[PDB]
Design an enzyme around this catalytic site. Structure first.
Site, short mmCIF file in Angstrom:
data_model
loop_
_atom_site.label_atom_id
_atom_site.label_comp_id
_atom_site.label_asym_id
_atom_site.label_seq_id
_atom_site.Cartn_x
_atom_site.Cartn_y
_atom_site.Cartn_z
CE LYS A 207 3.70 -4.37 12.31
NZ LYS A 207 2.35 -4.75 11.80
CG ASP B 225 10.51 9.49 0.01
OD1 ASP B 225 10.97 10.38 -0.77
OD2 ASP B 225 10.43 9.64 1.26
CG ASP B 226 6.25 4.58 -1.83
OD1 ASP B 226 6.88 4.70 -0.75
OD2 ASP B 226 5.01 4.59 -1.90
CD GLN C 138 12.49 3.36 0.23
OE1 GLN C 138 13.36 2.75 0.85
NE2 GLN C 138 11.31 3.66 0.75
CG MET D 224 -2.03 -1.22 1.01
SD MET D 224 -3.73 -0.92 1.58
CE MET D 224 -3.35 -0.51 3.29
CB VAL E 161 12.73 -5.80 8.37
CG1 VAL E 161 14.00 -4.94 8.58
CG2 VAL E 161 12.88 -6.65 7.14
N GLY F 100 5.03 -9.95 4.30
CA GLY F 100 5.73 -9.97 5.57
C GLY F 100 4.97 -10.73 6.61
CG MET G 102 11.30 -2.36 9.50
SD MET G 102 11.87 -0.79 10.10
CE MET G 102 13.66 -0.93 9.85
CB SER G 103 4.88 -0.48 11.35
OG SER G 103 3.51 -0.14 11.06
CB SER G 104 3.26 2.50 7.08
OG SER G 104 1.99 2.20 7.63
NE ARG G 105 -1.37 3.24 12.09
CZ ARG G 105 -2.24 2.66 12.92
NH1 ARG G 105 -2.61 1.39 12.74
NH2 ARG G 105 -2.74 3.35 13.94
CB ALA H 50 3.85 4.42 3.24
CG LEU H 51 7.33 1.04 -0.85
CD1 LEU H 51 8.07 0.82 -2.16
CD2 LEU H 51 6.42 -0.13 -0.55
CG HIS H 52 8.59 -0.04 6.11
ND1 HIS H 52 8.85 -1.39 6.15
CD2 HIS H 52 7.27 0.10 6.36
CE1 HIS H 52 7.73 -2.04 6.41
NE2 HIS H 52 6.76 -1.16 6.55
CD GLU H 53 16.25 -2.00 4.63
OE1 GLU H 53 16.12 -0.86 4.13
OE2 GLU H 53 17.15 -2.79 4.27
N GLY H 54 11.28 -3.04 5.47
CA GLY H 54 10.52 -4.29 5.52
C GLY H 54 10.02 -4.71 4.14
CG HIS H 55 7.12 -2.33 2.13
ND1 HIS H 55 7.03 -1.29 3.02
CD2 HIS H 55 5.87 -2.85 2.04
CE1 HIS H 55 5.79 -1.18 3.46
NE2 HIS H 55 5.07 -2.13 2.89
C1 LIG Z 1 9.79 -8.13 5.82
O1 LIG Z 1 9.51 -7.21 6.88
C2 LIG Z 1 8.35 -6.48 6.88
C3 LIG Z 1 7.99 -5.90 8.08
C4 LIG Z 1 6.81 -5.16 8.16
C5 LIG Z 1 6.03 -5.01 7.06
C6 LIG Z 1 6.37 -5.55 5.87
C7 LIG Z 1 7.50 -6.28 5.76
C8 LIG Z 1 5.39 -5.22 5.00
C9 LIG Z 1 4.47 -4.48 5.65
C10 LIG Z 1 3.33 -3.94 5.15
O2 LIG Z 1 2.39 -3.57 5.89
N1 LIG Z 1 3.25 -3.83 3.82
S1 LIG Z 1 1.91 -3.14 3.08
O3 LIG Z 1 1.09 -2.26 4.02
O4 LIG Z 1 2.39 -2.22 2.02
C11 LIG Z 1 0.95 -4.27 2.41
C12 LIG Z 1 0.11 -3.94 1.45
C13 LIG Z 1 -0.57 -4.99 1.05
C14 LIG Z 1 -1.50 -5.10 0.11
C15 LIG Z 1 -2.09 -6.33 -0.14
C16 LIG Z 1 -1.69 -7.43 0.62
C17 LIG Z 1 -0.70 -7.25 1.59
C18 LIG Z 1 -0.16 -6.04 1.79
O5 LIG Z 1 0.88 -5.54 2.71
N2 LIG Z 1 4.88 -4.35 6.91
C19 LIG Z 1 4.32 -3.70 8.15
C20 LIG Z 1 3.74 -2.29 8.08
O6 LIG Z 1 4.04 -1.55 7.14
O7 LIG Z 1 3.01 -1.98 9.05
#
Ligand SMILES: COc1ccc2c(c1)cc(C(=O)NS(=O)(=O)c1cc3ccccc3o1)n2CC(=O)O
Ligand SMILES: COc1ccc2c(c1)cc(C(=O)NS(=O)(=O)c1cc3ccccc3o1)n2CC(=O)O
Ligand SMILES: COc1ccc2c(c1)cc(C(=O)NS(=O)(=O)c1cc3ccccc3o1)n2CC(=O)O
Lengths: 288, 275
Positions: free
Chosen positions: A158, A86-87, A90, A38, A185, A156, A193-196, A40-45
């Site tokens: 998470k 940013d997305d 990355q 969705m 991550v 992920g 890790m989290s967008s929030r 708002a990409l972070h290291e987890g993505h």
């Molecule tokens: C490998 O380490 C991590 C750690 C935390 C992580 C991730 C990876 C990925 C997310 C995450 O949420 N991604 S997301 O919102 O863009 C998403 C969008 C979407 C759409 C359809 C199905 C599933 C979907 O998931 N997050 C946690 C986060 O952001 O809160």
């Protein structure tokens, strides 16, 4: 078939464009990897991207779509972080060759009509107070899967409940895709890790370490049994300033209608101010 | 290794995995995979679906036979072999639902109307199984009779809404010599009921021809014919646009009827052009 330039970031908005490119690539022997996000990409993505990049001969498709169908709520949709510039930067950095950035109109030209109805898991935990949330998630994920037709799709751990539900979608609808779960991550102190995370002030950011601390304490307490694990986690959450716990629950790995055996998942959801945080961990009881 | 497939013979598979592997193997060699979903007890309607499927150059035809819980075996296969069908897919309920009932398809609001009145959940079952069959077989085209018109529209909605990469082919309803729409229920009609049942098709055809005089003329014509039949309890008689929304002042539509005769429910529908 639209233009596809190998080695570069190709961005498609039309579902038909990415569908056509995807299929063309698959016929040339490339395996298509999907990382649905969705934004708002972070290291987890980026860890998801890297896992996908490492499958031999892969082409990586990263979808970015803030799916209105999985939000309640009033304001949650509007408040969701959007950082498009940013997305894509990355993704370019990571060597991703396809971003799929559809419009709401292209995804839902008929509004809400046919949808996915998840199984009973969607009414528990995160879905208890949010009855249509996971129907919204599964509907969009089904559509992205049908559009892109990837060999593998990456999520992920998470959002563990979401991952399980997605595995259910894939099994129950006989989808021809492999679901790959990728370990969470974490920040250096252990914060998932989290967008929030951006919504935590310094004090809340400090207190937020308690989630991961509680989970890892429980995972090691667990040689002493379930009660000890749960009590260790509760103690740590209770010691933390301004952490309001919503649930702390220990379940079987599938989160399903079965009792815990030796191998489980401990899940926590908690609020710090108005920010709701999730985390979870593998638990082995008696280890076991 | 790919499950055994003998071209130009009737190959029967009960495992979803087996048909999935063979269909993929076939697609890679150039064949266009056509799916005709059925619940067995095959009649001329089904053979019309099969024949339509066979017409596509380079076709391999897959006929599934599965009685969906959520919504003659040897004769069926003999009939398929006679038609030159190369694949029958005959799975068990357990193979189709190894984890029981869990994730399902929820139809849009159209499922609550018309046939969804006596059966509110019928279409959820149909759409879920059709989706599963599409995912297992991955056909290029899938074939349905027009007799269950509402069902057919809901299928097309499924395909649109979930971005499925299959072409949905509606095949005109096969009918008895007097116009009665083919149906597994027709055989239960006693001779008085079988005679009266001709009113459904007769009303709809009269309507289609009355339609030069407008919508109300067409509906009134249909109603008059139904009103001439004894023991025909009409549940609805509805004129809609071709997607089953409200009928536009002029243009293409569909006229749908459902009626009960004794204990058997009969349906029919027809293309209508207004003016
Ligand atoms: C490998 O380490 C991590 C750690 C935390 C992580 C991730 C990876 C990925 C997310 C995450 O949420 N991604 S997301 O919102 O863009 C998403 C969008 C979407 C759409 C359809 C199905 C599933 C979907 O998931 N997050 C946690 C986060 O952001 O809160
Ligand atoms: C337990 O308390 C509640 C309260 C409200 C609830 C439900 C349960 C169940 C639904 C429901 O299934 N609605 S729906 O089939 O039209 C649908 C809406 C939707 C939205 C996004 C994604 C998928 C979606 O599918 N609804 C909303 C309702 O009835 O209007
Ligand atoms: C082209 O002329 C006609 C005329 C009448 C027709 C057909 C063709 C086909 C059917 C019919 O229903 N077949 S079915 O029961 O095996 C079935 C299988 C299935 C699979 C998925 C969803 C719904 C499904 O319903 N019928 C009407 C009938 O037999 O009653």
């Amino acid at each position: 078939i639209p233009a596809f330039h190998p080695g570069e970031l190709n961005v498609y908005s039309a579902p038909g464009d990415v569908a056509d490119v995807s299929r063309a690539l698959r016929l040339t022997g490339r395996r298509v990897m999907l990382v649905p996000t969705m934004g708002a990409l972070h290291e987890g993505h980026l860890a998801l991207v890297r896992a996908a990049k490492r499958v031999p001969g892969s082409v990586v498709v990263v979808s970015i779509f803030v799916n209105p169908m999985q939000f309640g709520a009033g304001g949650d949709l509007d408040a969701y972080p959007r950082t498009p510039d940013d997305d894509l930067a990355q993704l370019r950095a990571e060597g991703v060759e396809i971003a799929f950035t559809p419009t709401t109109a292209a995804m839902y030209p008929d509004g809400l009509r046919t949808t996915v109805q998840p199984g009973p898991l969607a009414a528990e935990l995160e879905g208890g107070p949010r009855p249509t949330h996971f129907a919204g998630v599964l509907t969009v994920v089904l559509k992205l899967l049908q559009i892109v037709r990837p060999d593998r799709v990456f999520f992920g751990e998470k959002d563990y409940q979401q991952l399980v539900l997605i595995r259910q979608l894939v099994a129950d609808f006989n989808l021809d895709v492999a679901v790959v779960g990728v370990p969470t991550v974490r920040e250096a102190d252990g914060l998932a890790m989290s967008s929030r995370n951006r919504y935590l002030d310094p004090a809340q950011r400090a207190a937020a370490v308690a989630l991961s601390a509680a989970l890892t304490a429980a995972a090691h307490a667990a040689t002493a049994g379930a009660q000890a694990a749960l009590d260790a986690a509760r103690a740590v959450l209770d010691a933390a300033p301004g952490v309001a716990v919503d649930y702390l629950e220990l379940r079987d790995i599938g989160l399903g209608p079965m009792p815990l055996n030796g191998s489980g998942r401990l899940l926590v959801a908690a609020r710090l101010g108005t920010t709701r945080l999730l985390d979870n961990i593998a638990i082995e009881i008696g280890t076991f």
